[PDB]
Amino acid sequence: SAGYTVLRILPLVVLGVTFVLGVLGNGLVIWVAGFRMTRTVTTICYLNLALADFSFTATLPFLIVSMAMGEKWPFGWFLCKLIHIVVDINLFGSVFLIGFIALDRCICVLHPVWAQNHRTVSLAMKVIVGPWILALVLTLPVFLFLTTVTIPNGDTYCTFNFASWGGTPEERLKVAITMLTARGIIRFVIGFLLPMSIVAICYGLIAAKIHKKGMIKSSRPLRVLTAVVASFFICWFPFQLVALLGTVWLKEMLFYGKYKIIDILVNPTSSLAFFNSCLNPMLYVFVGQDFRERLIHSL
Amino acid sequence: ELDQLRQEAEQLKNQIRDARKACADATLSQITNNIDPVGRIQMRTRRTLRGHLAKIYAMHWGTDSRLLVSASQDGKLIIWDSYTTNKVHAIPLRSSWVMTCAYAPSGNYVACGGLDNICSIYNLKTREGNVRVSRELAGHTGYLSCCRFLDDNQIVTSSGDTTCALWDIETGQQTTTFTGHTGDVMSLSLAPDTRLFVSGACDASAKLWDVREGMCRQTFTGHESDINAICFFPNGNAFATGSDDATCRLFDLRADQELMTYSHDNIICGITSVSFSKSGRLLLAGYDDFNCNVWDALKADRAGVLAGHDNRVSCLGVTDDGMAVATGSWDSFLKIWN
Amino acid sequence: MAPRGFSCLLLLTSE
Amino acid sequence: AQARKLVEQLKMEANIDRIKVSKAAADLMAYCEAHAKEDPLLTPVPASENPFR
Amino acid sequence: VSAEDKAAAERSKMIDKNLREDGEKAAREVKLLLLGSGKNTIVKQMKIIGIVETHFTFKDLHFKMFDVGAQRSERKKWIHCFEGVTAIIFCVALSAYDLVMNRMHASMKLFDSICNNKWFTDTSIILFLNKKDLFEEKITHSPLTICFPEYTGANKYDEAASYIQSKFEDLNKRKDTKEIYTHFTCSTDTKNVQFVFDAVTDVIIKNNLKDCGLF
């Protein structure tokens, strides 16, 4: 356990730098796109992604001060539910917006005529509305099931609970296992499998389309595409795989506690996912020449 | 014969310069140094008009200082309620390549023109219903660069065919044609009495045209590059020209003299729009460096800078009472400054 | 997508 | 006939009399000082008298 | 008071709604500028539906071809009005090298005047070499040495046309930022229009990716 001190300290500094970078980048992107740039479809997609990331990172200090002493919550019931609702909604919205941006790029590259004749600002806003509705639907179990409970030692741990729902401890355990399994499967499929498949399939088609047409005049587009894909993969696949492994073995973990590496491995993976969320504007918005020109002109 | 007659014109031109040289004894700045400068004016954007989706090329202020017309390349001609930032009308254009627009002094008609070489007159009242085309003046072989209403029936339009023409709305025909320029005419301005107007062309010269006679009374050649903007002084005895040589020059009709020049060492871009305040003390001139500069019309001192635009500013107008100045630009935005 | 940290400590059924 | 027309137009420009440039400059300057008080751009006006708040 | 102010606000909101709809409707058409010599032939063969403005729809894509041939004024005064067009359709007469200041050199001067233009730095040019049928019967009788002294190949249409095409492409100093799509006009149906659609489609990819940030 000599090296566990690093495994405990590093997530804190990673979350802190993630908070700083995410707040700075998202504030800059929102200020430039929403006020200093033309209201376009790519502009509103980037603005929605930046708003989701900003609302996620503004919450990050709460998570930092929570996991500083081991996930304890010195705050209260309302603020705890607000924090976790904001985290889950913003994470789902960010991943869904990444998937939607990949789909929009694939549509623009593979079907230029459809993009020219059927990509309008109003329709774009209407179809951005959908991912937010999906995030709300998937955060509904965070809405009702999560609550604040206090251990007899006086420490406050606000997490999911089934005291009211089950009525009897066997029923409580059954419904708790059911909800955890359903939440894990939903996260792995909709939150990870759906966007990762979309990102891999889409961005591969843009790379294939430009390669077939011989439009590659420089290595910049290929480098940007592969950097985005690799960052998203190496930052989300570890966390989602750890969550899936925990959920499939969750019955054993509660009944016998056979697996314990997952408990200490979630934190670095969650830190990596958060750092991906904060770098999303850097690889998604900062890569545009017009955006950087507007940023340097506005300063 | 032809060569000898042309040579006599050069000698006559030298006589005009010699007459101007004898006339020129003291510069405007020489006698203006004994008055207090205006100083600095902190003009701020009171409101922004956001209804255009393309580059704005021209605008005109109403006589009531309440309604203004804006011309933009998206084929829309919007009448702006300046006080409440509302859109009174949105006139659709058959040709989206509009580069000029005019507002009638009575407020009943609005003109437009551009690459279509047609000056379309629009009736603002339209008691029958929505706004519609009233008349189309198609008699120019060059692009329409400027147009200004003399009254509800007479209008003079600039054109790229080097010739200016005065129109008649009821008849739809050219009442008179102003010939004598060399380059393409870019802008014209009308005196307050609407009895005499100036014109600036691409031949680096400013020409004074009499409305009734239709002939050139006066010619001003003092610019190194072509002239894109021109505007009378409020008193009507002087005017200022905006060129692409980064110099604004003030000319007075009484003496045919280059009174003074409005240029600064750090300005190299051209001028696309000029205007005067109520008293004419402030010469507001647009520039190609994405922002406007306010110039002192008597001391050549830059008394203010209008830097609230995202693209290059192409048009500029001052209200009749001088209450506010509205700036147009290619960023599809209209900024109003006090 | 928010990972539960200490929901395995049987606080899930605590009243 | 274009050259002859130009001379017929260039000649009359010299015929009209030109007043002294100093007199024109002084008269032009007098207009600015006479109308300076009714110039909102020259002197900012309060929001009560300014329709543009 | 508020009785008339509200009515004006509703009219402005209704007008603003129309402006957004009209702007969106006007945003799906491809704006092309014609310069050049076979320009009339290009317009006539694809006229499906001042300044000559024609609108045609091919493969569900709407085009707005603008001809500025009837403008005997300074180009630089109004050439900035077309800043933002998807592509420029430049027409060059292949058989104009012998015709006379050489006519072919005038086309090259006009071509260079827009390649180095500040308003079309990122705007592609869809070059067309018109009347190629007359050129093949003219290259044998009239050598290219009259028009291009620095020529060493044989007077054959197979390589003379390529040399002429390469001459215009090499004249563009704005390399690596825009692509010049060169084609030879043919009397066969749905091939000059297809090249316009194909070239514009590639340009739409460039515009989308530049906005996206890959390019």
Numbering used by the authors:
A (entry chain R): 19 to 317
B (entry chain B): 3 to 340
C (entry chain L): 1 to 15
D (entry chain C): 10 to 62
E (entry chain A): 5 to 40, 44 to 56, 184 to 234, 241 to 355
Which text from the study accompanies this structure?
Further investigation identified FPR2 as a functional receptor of HN, providing a foundation for this peptide suppressing the effect of Aβ42 by competitively binding to FPR29. Similar to Aβ42 and the formyl peptides, fHN binds to the receptor through its N-terminal region, with unambiguous densities for residues fM1–E15 shown in the cryo-EM map. The C-terminal region of the peptide appears to be flexible and likely lacks contact with the receptor, and thus, was not modeled. Supported by our functional data, the formylated residue fM1 of fHN plays a crucial role in mediating both receptor activation and receptor–peptide recognition.
In response to the N-formyl peptides from microbes and mitochondria, FPRs play crucial roles in host defense and inflammation. Although FPR1 and FPR2 share 69% sequence identity, these two receptors display distinct ligand-binding preferences.
